[PDB]
Design a protein around this nucleic acid. Structure first.
Length: 963
RNA sequence: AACUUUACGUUGUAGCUCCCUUUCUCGAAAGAGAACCGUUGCUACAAUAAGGCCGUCUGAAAAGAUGUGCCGCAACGCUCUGCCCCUUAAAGCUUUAAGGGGCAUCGUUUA
DNA sequence: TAAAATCATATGTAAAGTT
DNA sequence: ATATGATTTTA
């Protein structure tokens, strides 16, 4: 078994890992295995919405439609019973036969006349169906609702129906809303008033069925809709005292040597003041700039304290959170003796599931769950690791908004950098080479420092700015004791002045403690200088937490890192030094060590760089930090000229072992660093011979655990999902392969127009439309926003055109909407593969074929449609079944191709595969589109572990069912 | 992360309706009448994943009534189930048995 | 040709609230 | 990203 350190680089859609041996004193000595794990991040890629959004909106809509349908069913039953309809009015399907299709006009007429049973029924069903809007600043629909309400009772109109007809047919031509207008909505209260008024009139005129029974049934149906909805409710004495106290007890003051909570007398002074006084934070230190506290319940009742008690306060808190109305709240309060809500919350060898109560971001939950997968795979394979080193990406834990904000920020800063480099080139025309980062930064610091050597105030000649050994960008506070590479820690000073500083802060160097003249001049310099406030603050740090600062800069206090260190240190058997065995690297320090150790990247081409930073942070042990700190300290105050401790004049960074970058880059990429267009060593034989080959002096790089990197991917072998696309097209013409869809005029372009159904039936319409689209250079949304009519054979305009039909090609459907419509398909959960006569046959299995349980009986032939497709019987040998991201290999004479199954072409009978790391030196983004299967020799799906180990073929027996 | 409703949109079928291709009759032609389609606009009813169910009342079952009726595009996991893989051990490739893991058509959220 | 590789185009949406 | 009509290239 091994003593090893497992490094992890965690992303939103990838987890890279590596294992590095340690010697007894925890130096890096050897590298074993390394891997990547990719999946799909837990959100919709392009719109940032949740993954369950589609499912919940589907649920909401399903329930809405079934509840409305059921409402109408109950209304028909009620009609039949209270005596309006006999059994001759209804037909076989329980649908009232012979309905008047003229309900609005009947409503208006219905307040002057005795109506026969059928039209009374029609209006009643009409009101139940479209039942208006209920209560449950700005407006869009609410504006239209309120406008019609105002018109209806702050005007001369009788009633909503009548009003609607005249007003909406006088200046719109259409009663109902269309295409996202909301002005013709109605308040349910106004529909209710219209209903009662109609009942009065039908009572008056002698309508037979205007009974109390029908009135209650109909009215209740119209108005009734479901009302919106031992753990601790928060607005309770027990909960607010706790939120006050437990969040108070971790407030720390930076003391002389350590941090300290407030003294028992200090905490006592203001424990009871949020009780005794209404308010605070800025006045927390005024007694002992955000809020940080307010006692909501106690002070709400006050606004001389109040005289209540906990048992009563606990009961009123519970009663107000479980109930909303006056009704039940008074009940429990009445026995016991304002608005409340928002209830309160209340070692092995492997890692237990990530607590979804503790972790409530889906992206982070998925990333950490695959992190746990990788961790347990590594453990079961190699035994318990000594240390777990974690480096989690910057975008982990952030909202979609925040991620986008940062994406924006980095584009504008890249534009800025190009502009600044242009200025620098203009300043330095004869500059041999191109601007590097430190040169541009030297220019910025010159401008920022006012062209003054911030340590001496000497004017800096710009001509010599980029002279080797004239100006140097400095670590104001030194790097040995603080590990600060940050931009606020850098000031541009001459080389003449920065040679006797040592590793001293300016306050220990300019004798700031005796407030000497040099310190006064210096503080003035940086104060007036163009640096931000943060920079000025850190340049003049007087005394600080040496150990605190270094720990701060090596450790990430992000929530996910905090929790992850805590959860992997508490609930996991780690063979490490008991003090602190999990480590969350700082982003900038990991970046520094990668860039200084030779793995400065190739900027996202293939999917294996995650292993790079996993390796870089695996190696950040305390012994390595020792070595780096000694080296940096030395170089800080020279001492690199003939001397010795316990010192050659050209010593660069203490890398873990000699030839770190070479070995690591070979193993991770199979090619030597600097040469990414080599011949990849995709075998053990090539990789091991290349490691014994290229690396002469390192025979410790060839052992029995050297395996090439094969990225593992998320297996999504679900058999549920979307049934069909939500655009329903007519199937009347599906005999010949077409289907007609009403395309609205505002969004039909030339290509859509050419397929217009009546192109040979209104050459004047076709011609006007073609003419107009060509006239406006077809941008239809603007080109048809001017009402366009239908001119006669020899005459004036007659009829508006608001949408026109278009026939589109179709050879597949999904018969939806009661076999009345055909829709497109969307999800191919599976592809069953058969082999007869050394030929390979593909059988797509979709997700409606699963809902019905259809096991398809037909394979795919190119060009021929489903009715002329090869049938599959008992003569076909079963091979395997492919789901998305199933590792498959296909061998033919041309090539051998090995990857993850991604697509199956329905038309062409081909399948597409992704490469393991989606590389662009192969295919289209590493997706291999269009692969032969019928003419090939070998076709078999394999296995994959999360690590990449244990890749072995598959043979299946009995063909599985679809349900 | 759940939950109520609304208003559209799409498909189907009706009544009216703006255009119009062919086919039958009347006419010398000019024009008319019609039919089956296609389809512009308006209104209404049915459906609004594909698929599966419940409960209450008369009933002897038949079978009829009835409901603020219900689930179905996700995350995670291994208590149960299915597949696949890995070990381990015994006998003549399977069997038995024990164990472990990956993923789901399995389980919880969830009705 | 038949199969394999390539290219190319279409995917439902606003509102109002509640816990 | 998926699904799939339509088109070109190849044994």
């Amino acid at each position: 078994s091994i003593n090893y350190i497992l490094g992890l680089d965690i992303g939103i859609a990838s987890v890279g890992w590596a294992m590095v041996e340690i010697d007894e004193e925890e130096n890096p000595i050897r590298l074993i295995d390394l891997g990547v794990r990719v999946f799909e991040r837990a959100e919709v890629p392009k719109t940032g919405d949740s993954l369950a959004m589609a499912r919940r909106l589907a649920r909401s809509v399903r329930r809405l439609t079934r509840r409305r349908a059921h409402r109408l069913l109950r209304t028909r039953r009620l009609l039949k019973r209270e005596g309006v309809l006999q059994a001759a009015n209804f037909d076989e399907n329980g649908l009232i036969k012979s309905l008047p299709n003229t309900p609005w006009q009947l409503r208006a007429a219905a307040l002057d006349r005795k109506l026969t049973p059928l039209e009374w029924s029609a209006v009643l069903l009409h009101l139940i169906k479209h039942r208006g809007y209920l209560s449950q600043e700005l407006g869009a629909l609410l504006k239209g609702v309120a406008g019609n309400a105002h018109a209806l009772q702050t005007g001369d109109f009788r009633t909503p129906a009548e009003l609607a007809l005249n007003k909406f047919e006088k200046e719109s031509g259409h009663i109902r809303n269309q295409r996202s207008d909301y002005s013709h909505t109605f308040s349910r209260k106004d529909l209710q008033a219209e209903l009662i008024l109609l009942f009065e009139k039908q009572k008056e005129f002698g309508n037979p069925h205007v009974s109390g029974g029908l009135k209650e049934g109909i009215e209740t149906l119209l108005m009734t809709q479901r009302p919106a909805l031992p753990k601790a409710a928060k607005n309770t004495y027990t909960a607010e005292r706790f939120i006050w106290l437990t969040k108070l007890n971790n407030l720390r003051i930076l003391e002389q040597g350590s941090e300290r909570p407030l003294t028992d007398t200090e905490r006592a002074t203001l424990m009871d003041e949020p009780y005794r006084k209404s308010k605070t934070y800025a006045q927390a230190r005024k007694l002992l700039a955000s809020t940080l506290m307010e006692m909501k319940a106690y002070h709400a009742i006050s606004r001389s304290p109040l005289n209540l008690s906990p048992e009563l306060q606990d009961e009123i808190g519970t009663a107000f959170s479980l109930f909303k109305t006056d009704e039940d709240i008074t009940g429990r309060l009445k026995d016991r003796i304002i608005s409340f809500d928002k209830f309160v919350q209340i070692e092995k060898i492997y890692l237990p599931p990530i607590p979804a109560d503790e972790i409530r971001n889906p992206v982070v939950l998925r990333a950490l769950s695959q992190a746990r997968k990788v961790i347990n795979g590594v453990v079961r394979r190699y035994g318990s690791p000594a240390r777990i080193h974690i480096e989690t990406a910057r975008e982990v834990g952030k909202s979609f908004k925040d991620r986008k904000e940062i994406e924006k920020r980095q584009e504008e800063n890249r534009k800025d950098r190009e502009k600044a480099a242009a200025k620098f080139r203009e300043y330095f025309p004869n500059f041999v080479g191109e601007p590097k980062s430190k040169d541009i930064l030297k220019l910025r610091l010159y401008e920022q420092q006012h062209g003054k050597c911030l340590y001496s105030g000497k004017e800096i000649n710009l001509g010599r700015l980029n002279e080797k050994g004239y100006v140097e960008i400095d670590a104001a506070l030194p790097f040995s004791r603080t590990w600060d590479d940050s931009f606020n820690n850098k000031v541009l000073v001459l080389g003449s002045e920065n040679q006797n500083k040592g590793n001293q802060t300016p306050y220990e160097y300019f004798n700031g403690k005796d407030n000497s003249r040099e310190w006064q001049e210096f503080k003035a310099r940086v104060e007036t200088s163009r640096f931000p406030r943060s920079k000025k603050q850190r340049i003049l740090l007087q005394k600080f937490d040496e150990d605190g600062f270094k720990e701060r800069n090596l450790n990430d206090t992000r929530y996910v890192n905090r929790f992850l260190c805590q959860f992997v240190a508490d609930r996991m058997r780690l063979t490490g030094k008991g003090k602190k065995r999990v480590f969350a690297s700082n982003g900038q320090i990991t970046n520094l060590l990668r860039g200084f150790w030779g793995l400065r990247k190739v900027r996202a081409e293939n999917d294996r760089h995650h292993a790079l930073d996993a390796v870089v942070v695996a190696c950040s042990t305390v012994a390595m930090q020792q070595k780096i700190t000694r080296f940096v300290r030395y170089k800080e105050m020279n001492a690199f000229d003939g001397k010795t401790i316990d010192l050659h004049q050209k010593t660069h960074f203490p890398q873990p072992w000699e030839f770190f970058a070479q070995e690591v880059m070979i193993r991770v990429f199979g090619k030597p660093d600097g040469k990414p267009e080599f011949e990849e060593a995709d075998t053990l034989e090539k990789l091991r011979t290349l490691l014994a080959e290229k690396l002469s002096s390192r025979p410790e790089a060839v052992h029995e655990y050297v395996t090439p990197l094969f990225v593992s991917r998320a297996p999504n072998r679900k058999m549920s999902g979307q049934g069909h696309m939500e655009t329903v097209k007519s199937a009347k013409r599906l005999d010949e392969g077409v289907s007609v869809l009403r395309v609205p005029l505002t969004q039909l372009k030339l290509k859509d127009l050419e397929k217009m159904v009546n192109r040979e039936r209104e050459p004047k319409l076709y011609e006007a439309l073609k003419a107009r689209l060509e006239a406006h250079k077809d941008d239809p949304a603007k080109a048809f926003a001017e009402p366009f009519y239908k001119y006669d054979k020899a005459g004036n305009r007659t009829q508006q055109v608001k949408a026109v039909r278009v026939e589109q090609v179709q050879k597949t459907g999904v018969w939806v909407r009661n076999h009345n419509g055909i829709a497109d398909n969307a999800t191919m959960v599976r592809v069953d593969v058969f082999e007869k006569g050394d030929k390979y046959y593909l059988v797509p299995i979709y997700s409606w074929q699963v809902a019905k349980g259809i096991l398809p009986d037909r394979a795919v032939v190119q060009g021929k449609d489903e009715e002329d497709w090869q049938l599959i019987d008992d003569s076909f040998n079963f091979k395997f079944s492919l789901h998305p991201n199933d590792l498959v290999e296909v061998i033919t004479k041309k090539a051998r191709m090995f990857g993850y199954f991604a697509s199956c072409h329905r038309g062409t009978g081909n399948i597409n595969i992704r490469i393991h790391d989606l590389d662009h030196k192969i295919g289209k983004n590493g997706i291999l589109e269009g692969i032969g299967v019928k003419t090939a020799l070998s076709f078999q799906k394999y296995q994959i572990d999360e690590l990449g180990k244990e890749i072995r073929p598959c043979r299946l027996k009995k063909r599985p069912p679809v349900r």
